[PDB]
Design a protein around this ligand. Structure first.
Ligand SMILES: CNC(=O)c1scc2c1OCCO2
Length: 115
């Protein structure tokens, strides 16, 4: 509360570390469904169903331009990618399995880096 604060965590490396995690996810061989925005004109159903589209290149652009106020807002966009994937894709599909794999890959990096 006013004039009463927990000891100050060093956050000066967060921007660089999030960038490294995102790089490692961009180069995973199961990244291909997530590299670019889903084409809303070519994929029937997607625009109406998926209210907040998100993908790795959009995340990279936001990160590089100071549009994430902190650690948590970055992780929320990453999770949003895989939440969208689950909504639109059957678990038993190549893209469905790619989503599950990438989420697991992300959460491990996240834990080891910050938690
Ligand atoms: C995460 N990706 C998707 O949910 C979808 S839906 C249709 C697609 C695609 O990824 C790119 C190939 O075409």
């Amino acid at each position: 509360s006013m004039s009463v604060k927990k000891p100050k965590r060093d956050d000066s490396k967060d921007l660089a570390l999030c960038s490294m995690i995102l790089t490692e996810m961009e180069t995973h061989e199961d990244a291909w469904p997530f590299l670019l925005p889903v084409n809303l004109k070519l994929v029937p159903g997607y625009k109406k169903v998926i209210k907040k589209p998100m993908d790795f290149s959009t995340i990279r652009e936001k990160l590089s331009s100071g549009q994430y106020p902190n650690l948590e807002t970055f992780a929320l966009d990453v999770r949003l990618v895989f939440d969208n994937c689950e909504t639109f894709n059957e678990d038993d599909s190549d893209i469905g399995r790619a989503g599950h794999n990438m989420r697991k890959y992300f959460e491990k990096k996240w834990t080891d880096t910050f938690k």
